[PDB]
């Protein structure tokens, strides 16, 4: 109902959107099965892995205080005060994993700075978080969208889409993405923005006409492509409308939280490199109501996931993946790697400040978050998908993206390239 509290020598805070935003006056709405429950469980799995690992924090157990953000920055701010109760068996929190949404992470980062508590996000890509003046204690295992914007300009230019229109969801994400993309395009040369269209907020009183919006973009003079900065709901409707359109277009889209469908052939997207962590699937799919009381939200997840109540009644014999559809949520790798980054930082701090000791020294206990922050910023290790985890001077993961195209040759998103220190576009793998 409230929180997951796990005792340990040092305690990690966690922030996840276990629930969506509630109706209007209510803070919390429905369970978010993938973005909330899978991500939370990824942290719990990571802690279990570290706590059984004899070569990482050999004599130091990791505990946790994991809280629900209800996808609201105000609610998360209030929750975050739990992490400082020892200062103001009182819980002393050395670092925080989260939040998910960028607005949530920003708000959280503002309070955690004041108490010198380092934070590592597994999903927040807002460029403003890279500014170490305002967000010195904030790091992230995902890259900022500033890198993504450059990659988009690079792809658009390489494909010869020298006149484009932009389409963005209403909100600060879409506005920021378009101004960022626009600014980079001005600096690059050979790329002109024909028009910028904004999608209205999804009000219950109306139904947005995506067919009209797409038709107008495809009839714009000069425009070779549409570049899309979208939320989850908007992207699904935009690409369905694109598929239904009278004319074929070129589409490049970013945003959403994903990693039968109605998607226009050849639509391109660019998203941070990630992969399935197989050990997590075995853990998560074997969870039951009997063996997973640790997750205090798991009974609610169960009722939603199997459409039953504890009006079909839950038996407890339902199994994840058998009686429901299961695919690993795309950011599980990042949650795990955030937790491992914190652990590697603590391991090195312990080895530098301590020796031959059961648990944490007074010297390590006295080091504080400013010092742990430096250790965090200097970690360098192979993460849960066998790829390197590190941060730049601003606390940002390097810009490493895969490029996908939706294909109907023989149907789904296919890997057609990547953007790292170079742009690799495999023109031979693309549909023409
Ligand atoms: C952990 O405990 C063992 C046995 O007491 C000891 O040899 C080792 O030095 C300890 N490690 C650390 C990092 O304190
Ligand atoms: Ca250990
Ligand atoms: Ca930062």
Curated annotation (Swiss-Prot):
Disulfide bonds join 28-70, 308-314, 354-361. Expressed in many areas of the brain, especially in the cerebral cortex, hippocampus, and cerebellum. Expression of GRM7 isoforms in non-neuronal tissues appears to be restricted to isoform 3 and isoform 4. Glycans are attached at residues 59, 382, 410. Residues 1-432 are extracellular. L-glutamate binds at residues 102, 123-125, 173, 257, 331. N-glycosylated. It is found in: Cell membrane. It is linked to Neurodevelopmental disorder with seizures, hypotonia, and brain imaging abnormalities: An autosomal recessive neurodevelopmental disorder characterized by global developmental delay, hypotonia, severe to profound intellectual disability, early-onset epilepsy, and microcephaly. Neuroimaging shows cerebral atrophy, thin corpus callosum and hypomyelination in a majority of cases. Death in childhood may occur. G-protein coupled receptor activated by glutamate that regulates axon outgrowth through the MAPK-cAMP-PKA signaling pathway during neuronal development. Ligand binding causes a conformation change that triggers signaling via guanine nucleotide-binding proteins (G proteins) and modulates the activity of downstream effectors, such as adenylate cyclase that it inhibits. This is Metabotropic glutamate receptor 7. It comes from Homo sapiens. The gene is GRM7. The chain holds residues 40 to 511 of 915 of the full protein.
